Amino acid sequence: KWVPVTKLGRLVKEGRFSKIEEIYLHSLPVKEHQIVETLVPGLKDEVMKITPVQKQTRAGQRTRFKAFVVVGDNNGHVGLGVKCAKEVATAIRGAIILAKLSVVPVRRGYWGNKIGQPHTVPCKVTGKCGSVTVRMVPAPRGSGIVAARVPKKVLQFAGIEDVFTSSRGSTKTLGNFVKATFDCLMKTYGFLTPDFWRDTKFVKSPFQEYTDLL
Amino acid sequence: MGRVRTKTVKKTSRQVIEKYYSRMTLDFHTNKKVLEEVSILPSKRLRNKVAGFTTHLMRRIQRGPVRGISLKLQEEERERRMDFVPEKSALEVEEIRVDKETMEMLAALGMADLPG
Amino acid sequence: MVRVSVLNDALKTMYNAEKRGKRQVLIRPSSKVIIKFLIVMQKHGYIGEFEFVDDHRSGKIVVELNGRLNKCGVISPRFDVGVKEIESWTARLLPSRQFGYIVLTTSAGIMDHEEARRKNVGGKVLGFFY
Amino acid sequence: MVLSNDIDLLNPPAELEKLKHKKKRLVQSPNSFFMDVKCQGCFNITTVFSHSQTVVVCPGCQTVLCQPTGGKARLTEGCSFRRKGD
Amino acid sequence: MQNEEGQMVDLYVPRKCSATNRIITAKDHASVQINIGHVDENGLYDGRFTTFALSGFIRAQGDADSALDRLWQKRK
Amino acid sequence: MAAEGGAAARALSQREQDIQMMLAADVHLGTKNCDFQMERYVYKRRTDGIYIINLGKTWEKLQLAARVIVAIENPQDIIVQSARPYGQRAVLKFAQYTGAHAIAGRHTPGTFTNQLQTSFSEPRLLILTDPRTDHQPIKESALGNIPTIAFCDTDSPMRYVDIGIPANNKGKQSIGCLFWLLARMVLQMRGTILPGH
Amino acid sequence: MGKTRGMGAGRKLKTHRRNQRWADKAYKKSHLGNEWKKPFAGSSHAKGIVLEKIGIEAKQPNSAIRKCARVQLVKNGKKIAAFVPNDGCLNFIEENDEVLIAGFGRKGHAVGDIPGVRFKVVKVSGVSLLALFKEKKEKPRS
Amino acid sequence: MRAKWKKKRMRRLKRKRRKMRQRSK
Amino acid sequence: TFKRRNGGRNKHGRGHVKYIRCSNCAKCCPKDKAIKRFQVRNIVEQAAIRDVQEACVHDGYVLPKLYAKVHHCVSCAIHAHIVRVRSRENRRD
RNA sequence: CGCGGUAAUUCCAGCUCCAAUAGCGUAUAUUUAAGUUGUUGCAGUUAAAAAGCUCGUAGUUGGACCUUGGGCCGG
RNA sequence: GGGGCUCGAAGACGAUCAGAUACCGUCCUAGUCUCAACCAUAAACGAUGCCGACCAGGGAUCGGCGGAUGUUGCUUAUAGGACUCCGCCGGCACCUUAUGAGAAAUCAAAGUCUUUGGGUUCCGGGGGGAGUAUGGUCGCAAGGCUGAAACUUAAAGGAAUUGA
RNA sequence: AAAAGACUUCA
């Protein structure tokens, strides 16, 4: 079943929220995956990579598995789950849950010209994990996703159709490489345009609007 | 050695005391009977262990509050103390007796005040 | 050196601080950057203090931020004078992607990227406004 | 508070003009001064630079006036002075 | 935010701070919204507020209190 | 800087009586040479290596602070916190006066964070007696999107706790006086309150 | 730390740049003239004549006789060893025939596992090595 | 600057092995 | 390696002080890296105190203590005296 | 990089499959990748890497006042 | 040359050691010391170029200066000076956070280089070979300085983390 | 504290 635990879960499931846009605005911390499932049942999973971990441990080796799963729509929503567990299947299951928590929206935009319908990125944006620099780079439309297999997949969830990408740093470190691509897309809401410079009134927190119902 | 209380004993000992307290006593023998009423423990030695530990705790309670044991009677005592509230034991006597800095502020706030 | 870069660098680190200015000494190619900021409204006011008797010239800035969003997201230098790296009206390398402008000292004087481009006159980039 | 610069920049405290060097100042001036130093032996009072440097004597009376030191002059024995100059 | 062909485009106009200056991201769950009501005599006088936000970043920098204090005045 | 606007409720204005309690309680006693950049509140450095705090400036902060508390319709959602025995006295009596829930003694991590945990709290405001000792609860609240108001001394961190009130977290009657006054002010607007003191 | 940006100072950057290239393998090959030091002239293939069939043992955890043959280039005096790949082929090579050899794809250097074997055999007796093992074609008499 | 004991050993051997051809034995 | 704000070890605009030699081994050590320890201690003992003063002229004397700073080569201090190891935060003491 | 020490998806044949397709392999040179040549576009605390130090040239680089600033109409 | 007290490569002795040529013990020459001369190298280090501006709080201490009808001083009285102070130039550095950099350890610089271009210079540009070979240069000598390639080979190396 | 040295391949 559903069943919402927590005030945060009560707000969303009981139809007091209609959109995930609201959740992002008031910076509500998702930690139960069920919350995002009710508003968005259209989320698609995709197990990206399984990679072995090994320990030598106090009484026998105890070998774990990293599991990378990206859950998202194909419309501005990427979500990143990484779990380490002794069983492959358990790590995958947990990663699906984690990915749903960590869903964060991605600005699609235009370059120079306001074109028709956002399909690119508004600005040049970079994401760093370890030493690897990954760059969102302006591209004319119809270029396709100019990337290796795995960075294409991440940008499909983002809904971005056209960018050049380039990376430098250790590309050979599979674990880190997947992590680095995510950060760029979330950091889109970190770059100044005059378009988003425009001042908004401030919407009111659900914590004060729905005191009685909680 | 040997005779240390376990976790299972620690949880049970507090609980029995808390909601049986008037009936409970310092006396070992009667509190053995109480554990028959309150629980089924399968072997003989378990009953004796719990009964002994609880009575030792009962002595401590009636000589000072115990860290993880709160009773109806002890809670009432705490409440009575924390119903009193004047200013919260500041008085000083009428008008305060400041020592510059605030003297300059109080003068240009229309408050006379004593100094010292 | 030539100041210029120092102003730009100081500006962005001071934005992270959330200060209402930093105030510093200024020169004549760093008179230019401030007036260009006013036009594209990163500043809605600037004041050039003590430029009259003193050893130097200076200007305390009153600067946009302490609002909601920062207006100047990044300004970072792209080479001072004493160098040959050069652009023309057709050569145009850029930052941003048209949200910002590329600061250019042209033949007539300092003007923004679009003004210089229309007139069809090249020049040398001073910095990159994003 | 959040201050880099002051809430009233134009009038800072004197202690914050003792911060920044003489060259660096918002309104630069000599922090040094001229003063008239007073001597019983002479009828008139002699105008003197604050940082004496040389062991200045009063013009008519051979009384002395001050002795020099690393900063502003260290006046010697019983003498009086007002701080003024035109 | 317009398009070439009419339509207002690019949904989700985000939150964006006040005391801190920088966009409030979705990732930044640490960030907070402070509503201080305008008041009449003996009244909360709700439905009138000065609304402010505070980033997670400033809440680690230590400048969080300082920046809020400047803006906290009811009308400016 | 300082806030002005609105209409004063009644008792929210300054009284000679109100200042008398605060100065008697020794709220205005600041710590020694250490003193943060945030502190405008010293004016003239007082003898024997200590600074006393301008209580007229403090009054503005307290008056303003009350406005923020009551602006949520339901009063119980604010939780107060104090490990300290001096502030425990303040916390419990505050909770009695107002809607406010109390958490006395040890905080325990995973109260503010860890939503899955039973002890999950959502509070609209938090009042802490001393953010210096209660530094670990500040961290959880910061992540948890819970604002933390605290009565702070200058060597206590006004850093990263919004709305700082210069105080005397060292002990004595000072902490109890601050909460007592705060409770009186918040009840003044649309509460149980009566005129007078 | 940072590179000189300056109107005249261009010269400093240019002069240093050339030296760096020598670390890189491709430029080093031309600049030092290491290609000449390697047994080939620079040629696509080179031809030699079979001195001997030699049975070179594999290195380290691999154990096996690789079975090679040493050829002396027609162009040079240089004797070098070339590998004969595939089942048989030690029989198909033979002493004193003309063998056409090419590199491994190692771009000079010994392969690693076979010590000192710098080349491999492309064809023997003009036929094609590939054809002979496969039994597609048969060696001509003489 | 000067590195490690590799250069220390080889410094001693640098002129010794040049002179060990005049000596031979 | 670098875990230390202290740089190499006790080098603040100096590099080299002026050498003391260990009491134990006589290895050169600059003064700040030496390890000095105050051993201000009685000649007698606990028990011995009593015996001497009984069989001596003057009330107690004063007892004329022995004062020595003890110089170590680092290694020497580890084997008995004050080094022992630590926990990471208290090392900045 | 690795495999083959007798049930080798890495060999050798067959089968089947993949995949370019009148074209495909292989070698050498060369460009990209390689920001491994750093103009665009590098690194030097600890990974390759600040000269022991200072003076100091050829060489590069180098502050400000500087007939400039302002005002009016026309289109 | 003076000078050789002390200590002390090599050697020579005792244990230990299959060997022990060493640690360790004992003898002790050059030398250590000084002067006029050579020499040119060091983990000659902050393993961190020089210079300039900026970005962050706080307390010491070193130096000078300023302000106190402060203390001690008693200087005839004072000024000074030592002490306590606050302000301050320029320091050696620490402390705590680090906005930010970094691979991390860490770091108010290793920040202000992906926000990629402040001025100038030097150096590196896989590991070994090899810092040698060779030539030039220099040194009294030792040997230094300058400084390859053949050929080999897939990692050398760093920081942190988990085992043993 | 001085009595403590060696130790095959795939791995």
Chain A residue numbers touching F122 (CB-CB < 8 A): 7-8, 207, 214
Which of F22, F35, F48, F55 would best serve as a mutation to test chain B binding (most B beta carbons within 10 A)? F55
G60 closest-nt by C1' vs CA: L9
Give me the residues of F, 114-173, that contact E with CB < 8 A: 142-147, 157-164
Check CB contact under 8 Å for C23 and D5: yes
Work out if G115's Cβ lies within 7 angstroms of strand K.
yes
Q: CB burial class (10 A; 0-12, 13-18, 19+) of residue F116?
A: exposed
Check CB contact under 8 Å for F24 and B101: no
Work out if I92's Cβ lies within 7 angstroms of strand K.
yes
Type of residue at F169: N
> Which chain B residue's Cα is nearest to F96?
B83
> Which chain F residue's Cα is nearest to B84?
F93
> Resolution limit in angstroms?
5.5
Work out if H10's Cβ lies within 7 angstroms of strand K.
yes
The span from the CA of E63 to the CA of E22, in Å, is 14
Place of tokens 């040479």: F33
User: Which nucleotides of strand J come closer than 7 angstroms to any CB of the protein?
Assistant: 1-5, 11-13, 26-31, 33-40, 42-46, 50-52, 59-65
Q: Enter the DSSP assignment of F180.
A: H
Q: Do chain G and chain C touch with ≥3 beta carbon pairs under 8 Å?
A: yes
Type of residue at B59: R
Protein contacts of strand L with Cβ less than 7 Å away: G 60-61, 63; I 79
Q: Enter the DSSP assignment of F81.
A: E
Chain B residue numbers touching F21 (CB-CB < 8 A): 87, 90
Chain C residue numbers touching E22 (CB-CB < 8 A): 69-70
Chain C residue numbers touching A121 (CB-CB < 8 A): none
Segment holding F135, helix H or strand E: helix F135-143
Q: Write out the two tokens for I8.
A: 């190499």
The span from the CA of H14 to the CA of H9, in Å, is 9
Which of helix, strand or coil describes residue D35? strand
Check CB contact under 8 Å for F6 and E74: yes
Per-position b or e across F80-108, b if 16+ CB within 10 A of its CB: bbbbbebbbbbbbbbbebbebebbbeebe
Check CB contact under 8 Å for E21 and C18: yes
Q: Say if CB A46 and CB A148 are below 8 A apart.
A: no
Q: Distances in Å between the alpha carbon of A85 and those of A62, A96, C37, C74?
A: 10, 14, 55, 43
F61 and chain B: CB distance < 8 Å anywhere? no
Question: Rounded to 5 degrees, what are φ and ψ at B16?
Answer: -60, -45
Which of E20, E70, E72 would best serve as a mutation to test chain D binding (most D beta carbons within 10 A)? E70
- Of B96, B103, B107, give the one whose Cα is nearest residue F25: B96
Long-range contacts of G27-31 (CB under 8 A, 24+ apart): G29/G107
Place of tokens 């005397």: F168
Question: Rounded to 5 degrees, what are φ and ψ at F114?
Answer: 60, 75
Q: Say if CB G120 and CB G82 are below 8 A apart.
A: yes
The span from the CA of F17 to the CA of C55, in Å, is 55
- Of E12, A49, A163, give the one whose Cα is nearest residue A155: A163
- Assign residue I43 a region (left: φ > 0; alpha: ψ between -120 and 50; beta: otherwise): alpha
Place of tokens 């945060």: A8
Give me the residues of D, 47-66, that contact C with CB < 8 A: none
User: F39 Cβ partners below 8 Å, 6+ apart?
Assistant: F154, F166
The span from the CA of A113 to the CA of A110, in Å, is 7
Per-residue 3-state assignment (H helix, E strand, C coil) for chain A: CCCCCCHHHHHHHCCCCCCHHHHHHCCCCCCCCHHHHHHCCCCECCEEEEEECCCCEECECCCCEEEEEECECCCCEECEEEEEECCHHHHHHHHHHHHHHCCEECCCCCCCCCCCCCCCCCCCEEEEECCEEEEEECCCCCCCEECCHHHHHHHHHHCCCCEEEEEECCCCCHHHHHHHHHHHHHHHHHCCCHHHHCCCCCCCCHHHHCCCCC
Place of tokens 């008085």: B91
Number of CB pairs, chain D paired with chain E, less than 8 A apart: 8
Name the method of structure determination: cryo-EM
I79 closest-nt by C1' vs CA: L1
Distance E24 CA to K53 C1' (A): 32
Place of tokens 């004329």: I64
G33 closest-nt by C1' vs CA: K149
Give me the residues of E, 1-60, that contact C with CB < 8 A: 16-23, 58
- Of F34, F138, F134, F30, give the one whose Cα is nearest residue F91: F134
Which of helix, strand or coil describes residue F124? coil
- Chains interfacing with B (3 or more CB pairs < 8 Å): F
Long-range contacts of A87-90 (CB under 8 A, 24+ apart): A88/A50
Q: Write out the two tokens for A111.
A: 């370059």
Segment holding F128, helix H or strand E: strand F126-128
Which of B96, B99, B109, B114 would best serve as a mutation to test chain F binding (most F beta carbons within 10 A)? B96
Q: CB burial class (10 A; 0-12, 13-18, 19+) of residue H1?
A: exposed
Residue C46 C-beta-side C-alpha neighbours within 13 Å = 22
Give me the residues of E, 1-60, that contact A with CB < 8 A: 1-5, 9-16, 22-33, 35, 49, 51-53
> Which chain A residue's Cα is nearest to C64?
A197
Distance F33 CA to K142 C1' (A): 64
User: Which nucleotides of strand L come closer than 7 angstroms to any CB of the protein?
Assistant: 1, 9-11
The span from the CA of F135 to the CA of F140, in Å, is 9
Q: Distances in Å between the alpha carbon of D50 and those of D31, D33, D56, I11, I25?
A: 10, 6, 11, 43, 62
